[PDB]
Design a protein around this ligand. Structure first.
Ligand code: HEM
Length: 399
């Protein structure tokens, strides 16, 4: 059994193992860091099954849960939020914050999302690049998702920049263990204060609604409110940043498609659809342990055995997506859902928001800067560690 997680074939490529497994051993065993074994599911149909099977659990206190790192095993001890819950607890808590993420709520948020993007792009323009390149990530990819989620949660305008930098240090590869934890503690400390303030005088934000609707009635306590807010902040920010960056690098890799996007920004939605399928920036979140024996493919997964379902592999499943390794914004989509945001009950709570953010970004970026170009040869782009989810650390650009 090979060691998992696998390492990406190259910077923008997914691990080479998946394609081989999908064709020869779709449901196999991989060895984890602590030596334990887990079942790796690689086919779209099977990934979907794992994501919805009632015989599988996301509770991390069950022996056999596939923790991929030493830290992940330690994080499993704390009190769980809905991300690690099974029904009925899962929706009991998730529904407490879902209202802000519904399709209708996100549609009504479009003007705000646009404004946030426009203001950051103009700040980037004024900042100019007459003396050299600017880092698209630091100046645009990082603050877009950050400001939006922080603002939705209830953080005031003046605190955004500092909090955005701190949350980044959390996941920054350059950060030492101590720096990442201190930054993490800071965000939690800040959130604790916000909850206290919002309990006194609620405002129009997520934290306020949790305080008024759940904390006050006694459904959850203050710490719970802080943890749910923390989850919403750290669950998808780093991923949003990587998606925007990979989107720009991808358009630079396929000039004709960039020309097409510029010529018709109305194509942004489909470009985003293909981007989320082609670049699965969160490929290690669909994990479970079997509550009881369950049959998947030609394998029997026994009770208490862990399972990892690669939505990244499923998104390159040739049986579902024709020419899967070809990035095509004009792709003819099949009836099967691409799985960039997971599947089933736990499907990304912010999928509509994330897509709206990306669609706004790619229907605006090149209209603001029609001549935007990566200021380094594309083959020298600084990507995330090959053994980690796909993403880009920094992207020098000129415009
Ligand atoms: C484009 C960026 C994003 C991608 C690609 C993404 C992807 C995912 C994936 C693959 C999962 C696993 C779903 C499953 O278990 O089947 C997930 C879960 C989740 N995401 Fe996102 N996400 C993104 C942005 C966001 C944002 C912006 C937020 C916060 C506002 C967020 C909050 C969450 C939460 C809370 C969960 C857990 C849902 C649950 O377990 O019920 N995500 N996301």
């Amino acid at each position: 059994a090979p060691s998992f997680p696998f390492s990406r074939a190259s910077g923008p490529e997914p691990p080479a193992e998946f394609a081989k497994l999908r064709a020869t051993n779709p449901v196999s065993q991989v060895k984890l860091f602590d030596g334990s074994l887990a079942w790796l599911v690689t086919k779209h149909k099977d990934v979907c099954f794992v994501a919805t099977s009632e015989k599988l659990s996301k509770v991390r206190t069950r022996q056999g849960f596939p923790e991929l790192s030493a830290s992940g095993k330690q994080a499993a001890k704390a009190k769980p939020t809905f991300v690690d819950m099974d029904p009925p607890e899962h929706m009991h808590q998730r529904s407490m914050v879902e209202p802000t993420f519904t399709p209708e709520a996100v549609k009504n948020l479009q003007p705000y999302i646009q404004r946030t993007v426009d203001d950051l792009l103009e700040q980037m323009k004024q900042k100019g690049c007459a003396n050299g390149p600017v880092d698209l990530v630091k100046e645009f990819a990082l603050p877009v998702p950050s400001y939006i989620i922080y603002t939705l949660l209830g953080v005031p305008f003046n605190d955004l920049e500092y909090l955005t930098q701190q949350n980044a240090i959390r996941t920054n590869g350059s950060s030492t263990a101590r720096e990442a934890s201190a930054a993490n503690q800071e965000l939690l400390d800040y959130l604790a204060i916000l909850v206290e303030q919002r309990l006194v005088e609620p405002k129009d934000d997520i934290i306020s609604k949790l305080c008024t609707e759940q904390v006050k009635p006694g459904n959850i306590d203050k710490s719970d409110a802080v943890q749910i807010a923390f989850l919403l902040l750290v669950a998808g920010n780093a991923t949003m940043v990587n998606m925007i960056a990979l989107g720009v690098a991808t358009l630079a890799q396929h000039p004709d498609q960039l020309a097409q996007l510029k010529a018709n920004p109305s194509l942004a939605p489909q470009f985003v659809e293909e981007l989320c399928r082609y670049h699965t920036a969160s490929a290690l979140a669909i994990k479970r342990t079997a509550k009881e024996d369950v049959m998947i493919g030609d394998k029997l997964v026994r009770a208490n055995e862990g399972i990892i379902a690669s939505n990244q592999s499923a998104n390159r499943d040739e049986e579902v997506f024709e020419n899967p390794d070809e990035f095509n914004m004009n792709r003819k989509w099949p009836p099967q859902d691409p799985l960039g945001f997971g599947f089933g009950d736990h499907r990304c709570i912010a999928e509509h928001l994330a897509k709206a953010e990306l669609t706004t970004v790619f229907s605006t970026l090149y209209q603001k800067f029609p001549d935007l170009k990566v200021a380094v040869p594309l083959g020298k782009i600084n990507y995330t560690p090959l053994n980690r989810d796909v993403g880009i650390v920094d992207l020098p650009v000129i415009f």
